[PDB]
């Protein structure tokens, strides 16, 4: 059947941000989790480039 | 009204007597119109060698098939005709033949028992007919997983000892055993000082004695002397025997540590802890609310179809453990929980639960000693294994003495960090590895 569902890697992705059952309910206050994630990679990404010189 | 305590003092004292022979004739009179009489012999399979093995079992098959005075079929005709019941059994250390009969029939009952016990007409035609029968029995016994697992458990626990052997013997012995082989076994074993004439019911001990002298007179009189061995202790090994067979639908597992044996006072406490773990079967009413954590967790998570603790006693040794039946994917969990309970009891038995276990035992004992048969069997066995008959009042006293400290002390001695004897049959892919079963026999917090 469907690859997204059974591939040992995608399963994760799929069950983490694709098929995951979520409340129809959650509002803007729920966006901060993903923004924290974005803040993290951003600090990692720019932070790295800063270390190639600092 | 009469208290429980008082009620124990009311139980008539078992009467003992000895013939100038070695035959101990013991009885317990009651007012019943019925009774049970019999011979308990210190003959088993723990007494046999690798080639005699199956001997006693073979003799039982011949026992009621003809004596010298009562040929081929007459003995039955007599028992049946008076409405009596003739039965027999053999374990690894004991052999019995007993009759259930109307009290007045006590005379003939005994006269018959004696005849069977001494004049066994092992006629070739029959010794031959019995071999196709015993062979058949083995074939059916093979379908009883439970019987197979305890045989396996013995086989490994007692590796290299006679106690390793099964009662019925191996098929090769069943087909090769000679009359000479049987004759020898009887003479070596069925002799006065190793057998007890027991009875329970409406009889007077005098009567019993009269009869013991009347029909059992003339065994070890001009006998005793040379060729009478003692039993050598049996080494317990602590190992595993896994018979893997995915064709069966439920797995049987039997684990045990080495027990002390018959005479050890430690048995009472061991029996109380067992009672706390108890048993379970899928038809038990009350699952989740059961007292035993094993049973309750077992029932709630459907971790098995049944389980039972046990304490099999042999002279100086024994098997102490539990047996269970479960689905292929539950063996691990079941093992974990069972072990968890032993450990818990070893390290932290609470006081309340020990009273339950005690109460369970008093109820089991008293409930078991109900009716002539069980009592006669208790007289006969007790004399063979205690030399005395232990009055309920004393067992109560012994039970009474157990409290929590005793439980966690006595359980620790036998269970804590000891090597189990493990026997597995069925779809046992998930039966834990021995190392891991052994690791579950102690715990790192303690």
């Amino acid at each position: 059947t469907n690859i997204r569902k059974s591939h040992p890697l995608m399963k994760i992705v799929n069950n983490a941000f694709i098929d995951l059952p979520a409340p129809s309910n959650i509002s803007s206050w729920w966006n901060f989790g993903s923004l924290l994630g974005i803040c993290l990679i951003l600090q990692i990404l720019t932070g790295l480039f800063l270390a190639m010189h600092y | 009204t009469a208290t429980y305590a008082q009620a124990l003092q009311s139980v008539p004292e078992t009467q003992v007597s000895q013939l100038d022979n070695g035959l101990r004739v013991a009885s317990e009179q009651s007012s019943q119109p019925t009774c049970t009489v019999g011979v308990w012999i210190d003959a088993g399979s723990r007494y046999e060698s690798e080639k005699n093995n199956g001997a006693g079992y073979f003799v039982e098959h011949l026992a009621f098939k003809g004596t010298k005075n009562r040929p081929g079929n007459a003995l039955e005709k007599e028992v049946e005709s008076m409405g009596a019941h003739l039965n027999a059994y053999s374990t690894r250390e004991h052999t019995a033949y007993y009759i259930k009969a109307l009290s007045k029939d006590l005379p003939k009952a005994v006269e018959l028992l004696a005849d069977i016990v001494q004049n066994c007409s092992l006629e070739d035609s029959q010794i031959e007919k019995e071999r196709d029968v015993i062979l058949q029995e083995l074939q059916e016994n093979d379908t009883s997983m439970r019987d197979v697992v305890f045989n396996y458990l013995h086989a490994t626990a007692f590796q290299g000892t006679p106690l390793a052997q099964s009662v019925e013997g191996p098929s090769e012995n069943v087909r090769k055993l000679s009359r000479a082989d049987l004759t020898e076994y009887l003479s070596r074993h069925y002799k006065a000082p190793r057998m007890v004439l027991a009875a329970a019911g409406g009889l007077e001990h005098r009567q019993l004695l009269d009869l013991a002298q009347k029909h059992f007179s003339g065994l070890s009189g001009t006998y005793d002397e040379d060729a009478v061995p003692t039993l050598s202790p049996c080494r317990f090994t602590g190992s595993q025997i896994c018979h893997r067979e995915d064709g069966l639908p439920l797995a049987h597992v039997a684990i045990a540590v080495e027990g002390p044996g018959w005479a050890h006072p430690d048995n009472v406490a061991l029996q109380v802890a067992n009672a706390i773990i108890g048993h379970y079967d899928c038809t038990y009413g009350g699952g989740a609310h059961l007292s035993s954590p094993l049973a309750s967790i077992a029932a709630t998570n459907k971790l098995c179809q049944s389980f039972q603790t046990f304490n099999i006693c042999y002279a100086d040794t024994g098997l102490l453990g539990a047996h269970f039946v479960c689905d292929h994917m539950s063996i691990d969990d079941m093992m974990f929980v069972l072990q968890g309970q032993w450990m818990r009891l070893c390290t932290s038995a609470t006081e309340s639960e020990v009273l339950r276990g005690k109460n369970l035992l008093r109820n089991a004992l008293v409930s078991h000693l109900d009716g002539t048969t069980p009592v006669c069997e208790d007289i006969g066995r007790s004399l063979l294994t205690y030399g005395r008959r232990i009055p309920l009042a004393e067992w109560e006293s012994r039970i009474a003495e157990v409290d929590a400290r005793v439980v966690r002390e006595v359980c620790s001695k036998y269970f804590y960090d000891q090597c189990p004897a493990v026997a597995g049959f069925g779809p046992i892919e998930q039966l834990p590895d021995y190392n891991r079963i052994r690791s579950g026999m102690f715990w790192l917090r303690f």
Partner: protein, 51 residues
Amino acid sequence: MLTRFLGPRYRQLARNWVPTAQLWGAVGAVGLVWATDWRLILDWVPYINGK
């Protein structure tokens, strides 16, 4: 609402684990002491006076 854990059984349970909890503290004591070479404590121990 820790009253759920207050009764005879629980009291028996606590006594049963006392020797164990005591011994586990003996292990942690010596454990830190030895691992930091506790000058203060170790001076009392015969043969471990490496000064």
